Amino acid sequence: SGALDVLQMKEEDVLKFLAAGTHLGGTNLDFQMEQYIYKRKSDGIYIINLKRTWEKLLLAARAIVAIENPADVSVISSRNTGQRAVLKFAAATGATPIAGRFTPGTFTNQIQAAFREPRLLVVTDPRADHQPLTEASYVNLPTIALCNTDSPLRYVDIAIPCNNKGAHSVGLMWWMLAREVLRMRGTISREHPWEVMPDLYFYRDPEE
């Protein structure tokens, strides 16, 4: 980075990452996903580094800020875990959520009453939301997403590594993303702790 400590790692957030198990990562690698891994464990787990997570969070977020009108940075997730997360995301920062089954042809059509035309996309898990990704390259959208350690990289301009096999790893990462964009664009910045909880960005989950 280059800012003094106000765009660099904080002692607090390290604890939150490790409590939510984001550092742990799946038992497979790609030829593009080996530049964020450090090494393997005794176990089949492959340990994502959090330094490498932190830088990628920032320039990803700075691009989300750069649009003049935030009302067309369309977020998407279809897996259950990333549903509750995206809804709070797009409430907090001006965005348009697309929860559940995508319904393809959304941006390709001209005649469709659910037609959209955003600029950016922020997708959870490339290999569950493959339909909008393929469709991104017909309308010249930049793309950002959360990769595991083995998700295919293709139509992903920038990645933000994560564990993302569920748990608290999903909701935590979307919460952190929303923290950063408000520090930069808004006036929420104070470098002293944000009021909003990462708790209500987690999965609803079958209740008591």
């Binding site: 790692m9 002692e11 390290v14 604890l15 939150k16 490790l18 409590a19 939510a20 550092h23 450090y38 090494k39 464990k41 005794s42 176990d43 089949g44 340990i47 580094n49 959090l50 330094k51 509750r84 809804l87 709070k88 608290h168 935590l172 909880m197 990462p198 708790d199 209500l200 609803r204 989950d205 209740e207 008591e208």
Partner: protein
């Protein structure tokens, strides 16, 4: 028997239960007379069918949601769970437990706080 309801019935049945949710009983005869009054029905026989399905929907909707049809009070409770579920805030007891070479990563993050350990066993699979 035979006979599965047509699409004209199931399509309009959904509309009629949605916007007059609080005007339905769980009796055939009451729900029949209501449909005649709140809307035109081009026949009598058609009315007697659409009423009976409107009734059949209203039974299940009081046991939770049926997909493609959203009443107000369910979308209320949806929001009420989504602004905060009743369950506690905590992440997840405010203590981190680490293993060898997770600690090694943390050295290379240039931090070191709240040490714990659990020692792992060789080897993957067997």
């Amino acid at each position: 028997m035979g006979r599965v309801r047509t699409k004209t019935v199931k399509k309009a049945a959904r509309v009629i239960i949605e916007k007059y949710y609080t005007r339905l009983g769980n009796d055939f005869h009451t729900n029949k007379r209501v449909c005649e009054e709140i809307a035109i029905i081009p026949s009598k026989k058609l009315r007697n069918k659409i009423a009976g399905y409107v009734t059949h929907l209203m039974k299940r909707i009081q046991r939770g949601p049926v997909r493609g049809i959203s009443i107000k009070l369910q979308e209320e409770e949806r929001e009420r769970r989504d602004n905060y579920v009743p369950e506690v805030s905590a992440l997840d007891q405010e203590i981190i437990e680490v293993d060898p070479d997770t600690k090694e990563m943390l050295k290379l993050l240039d931090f070191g706080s709240l040490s714990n350990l659990q020692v792992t066993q060789p080897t993957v699979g067997m």
